[PDB]
Symmetry: none
Subunit: 91 residues, 6 copies
Amino acid sequence: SASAEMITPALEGATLSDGQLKDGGKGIKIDEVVKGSPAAQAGLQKDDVIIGVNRDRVNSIAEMRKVLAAKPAIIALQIVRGNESIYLLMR
Amino acid sequence: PLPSLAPMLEKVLPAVVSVRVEGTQPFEGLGSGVIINASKGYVLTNNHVINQAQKISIQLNDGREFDAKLIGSDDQSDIALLQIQNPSKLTQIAIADSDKLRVGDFAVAVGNPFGLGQTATSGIVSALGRSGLNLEGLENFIQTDASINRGNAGGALLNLNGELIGINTAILAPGGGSVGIGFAIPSNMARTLAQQLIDFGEIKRGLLGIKGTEMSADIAKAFNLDVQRGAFVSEVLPGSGSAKAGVKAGDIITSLNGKPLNSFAELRSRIATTEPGTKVKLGLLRNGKPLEVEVTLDTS
Amino acid sequence: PLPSLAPMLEKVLPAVVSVRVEGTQPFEGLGSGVIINASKGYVLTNNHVINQAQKISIQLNDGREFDAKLIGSDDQSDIALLQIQNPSKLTQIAIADSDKLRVGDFAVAVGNPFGLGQTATSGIVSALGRSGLNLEGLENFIQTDASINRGNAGGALLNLNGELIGINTAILAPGGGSVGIGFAIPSNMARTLAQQLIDFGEIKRGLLGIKGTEMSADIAKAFNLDVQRGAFVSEVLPGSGSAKAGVKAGDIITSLNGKPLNSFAELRSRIATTEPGTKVKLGLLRNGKPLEVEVTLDTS
Amino acid sequence: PLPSLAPMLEKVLPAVVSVRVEGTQPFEGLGSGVIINASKGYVLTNNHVINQAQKISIQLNDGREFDAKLIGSDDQSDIALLQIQNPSKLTQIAIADSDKLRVGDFAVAVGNPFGLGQTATSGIVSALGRSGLNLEGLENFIQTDASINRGNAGGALLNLNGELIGINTAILAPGGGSVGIGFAIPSNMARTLAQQLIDFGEIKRGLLGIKGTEMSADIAKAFNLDVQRGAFVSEVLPGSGSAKAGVKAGDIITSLNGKPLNSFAELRSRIATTEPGTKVKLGLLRNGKPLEVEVTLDTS
Amino acid sequence: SASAEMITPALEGATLSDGQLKDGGKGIKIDEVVKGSPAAQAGLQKDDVIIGVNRDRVNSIAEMRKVLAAKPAIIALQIVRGNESIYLLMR
Amino acid sequence: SASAEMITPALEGATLSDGQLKDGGKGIKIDEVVKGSPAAQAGLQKDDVIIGVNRDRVNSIAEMRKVLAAKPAIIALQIVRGNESIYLLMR
């Protein structure tokens, strides 16, 4: 469970683990979100499934880690909450 | 022979009246208002002062005094409407559309600053469509550099022909005085709210069933997009008119009814004013290509 | 080609001069004045600037310096007159009828803000006849939105033709700076008082002999009167010219010399300025019946 | 049909850009700048904005954001120039001659007040050649009454045609807000400084070698001189170009290059701007007798 | 002497007595007005003979209590100070 | 060595003595100016030779004293140092 604090300051208080979709798509599954943290301010929620970051498609922590190595101002986060696809950002 | 604003202000100044608010410890505030209908004596003011009012008094330009009963209110847009009892030989202002406004048009602000009386000051339209000032629920302010002081709430912003184009609402004052920055609600929003409040007695607010954030510059360049101003939809709500039309998450909204979009707050303001059940076209952007869809507004 | 105020201003700025006042703990004050007679070098100013003056110095715009001595002043009108010692190549300014001034006219202010030099700011006349500001004994100010700051007292207020129409006296500064509100004494009242001061050495204030209060819309409603602006007569002193004229208690003053007055303070200022012995006409209401009465002013 | 300022601003507004300063405890800055050359993207700002800047960001009015690197800066004149990398579809502004400016011309100031965006305010030129404000080494500011506030540093001043005639630098705020007086460096000094900055990358100050103080009216009256505005010569440094030309102590500077001057501060600023080695004409006066001498410039 | 404070707040600080006019008319003869009270602020003094109120002619306590029951914003009571008819205004 | 303080307040902290110029010209010798005094702030230093007071030429302390008795608002002093001439202006 790699912490998101060491990836970007805005994602403090979130626990990440590589998860799979309902159809088997590789991604990251959210474990827990700390209430009142900047990550919770972005709308992070338990049991969520990450599938991509910005425009690049990701499958593990290393890929979006080296994507954020360039440190964009705002990270788009493709995510499938249930059967409805939503998005998560940062500031 | 000399150029002056006096000929235009001769037939306009009596229209604008003051407002004396007494409510609750007793509170004695004051503001201004505009008479929109003279036959039945409806006045248009700001909901800021009326909110804690028990008895409301109106002072005309010639000193005549009346009494006012509030008809309705709009908390989100800070607009309230009052009626003057036994109106007699009253005059009303003419409202012109603010959609044709441009940065640089002259404007004259009429109000009651510091309670001294009716004061007319000059200025220009500093910038249109200013938003995100954490002043209201809805932001579509018109910014003007005319000296707008305390007690100017509910005033009037006029062109050189004497037509109302704005209602002064909020000012920026680091030390309690105007620094050449004043914010006024446009007349198109005010006129539509007045007609709805007169005919219905309440507000019928529409929505699209869309949740999203404002468009920045980093996301557009990271996605290879030629547009930097718009709305970034984050989620579509099932059962809404947006779902029926077929809009999807991650889209960018660029234009509305052919008129272009400046910020996410502007879209929220225009969509809320619009009557529910009407069809409006949207300029969307999907993966670098533009598309247009027709959506029927729902009811809040 | 490009419209500008330079063609008109370039012939006017040399007329306005600055004044430094030193006196006593010692203090150094600064102000401004306007030259009204080139041959004799009379300079108008404000009483409160010169109230505690020990030495007076005058500098023009080009750096030339002179000396002056106080001629006469009145504490209740806040104006004074000075004579420039050994005048040499001095220019004067014209005086226009401030009675024809109407709201919406353009006007520029010339003076020394914060002791930086001679500056010219622009503006308009917010509203005329403003009074009851508890700033002085006599209030007949005209309000202008041109930025008037500290050190601008005793300056000038010019129309677009370069003629003087007012003298800046007081400002409304909630935080020590201009907020677009500036009060200027009219020119007709200042000019006439100046002529009396230099001819006779002191003023002569006329009095009707009536003690009374102002009008409000409440009083007219109780008494069933159509007019809500005027003066309320409360007591007629015996032996006064008004008593001989035939005015009694309860009289309402509506017109003065055929001109309507919007407040009670206006009547006080116009009567006091007028020299004793003048015959004037007054339009009064007596139980709703208008009549006309001739009164001769007494001497203070 | 209506007389409005909009047609001029449409082609001029996108030429002015904002500037964000981040770095060091961390601190955030904000300002404005003017694009001079569109082909390469040279923007002009004030040095005090980027005196401690680590990263500099520039956003147009459309929201597009770039990054810039500091080409060079001048501490005395408080002017710096920045280069925008990957310039693409940029707009430049014209440069007018501030030597033709006069009191009474209309001016429009654009900028970024209080982080609200790009706002344009109106005003006129109060006075020129103001100095002695303990701000910079060289002071030849143009003072204008347009309401400019914090964040407007490095902004623009536009005539009725849209050509740059100033650069906002400083305000006089007793309560943290605008009062109606704003100081701006002229355009000719800014343009000449810009040419040196992009052609070489550093400044070359011109120096004469004369030590002196301000001229007062008392000194002229002591020496019986008709002029009271100029520079008083107190010492001539051996080995300077002035010594070669024959200028010695007891001397009064009257005119520069055939044009009358206002103060010794103006002479100091213009001399520093002028390139070293160039020959200049000096209006000279000694013992009440005018003289004309030609001198060369050294390197500071 | 009926209490004047209860009648209206603006008349507080005065003592009222139903006297008579010098010519035989009926009016209110003021007994005392406390200095600094709102009655004194309006100019009430000793031996004031109130003969009228606004428009209606007043003769007794019942009638001016009746007219003040409507709570007029500003009172205008006409008296004869000595032999001079004057108008004293209250709130 | 009459003190310059009693001539004018601006000359406080400097001692003046009567000597002669190199070419025999009668003048005033400056012996000592204390640091921080307005005279020191005016640029007055040691070995300065007073040769003029504004316009009037002086030779002793009394001449410049009666010149300054009129108390001019701004006072000028023409000094010769080495082989060059300089001027001092103090209010």
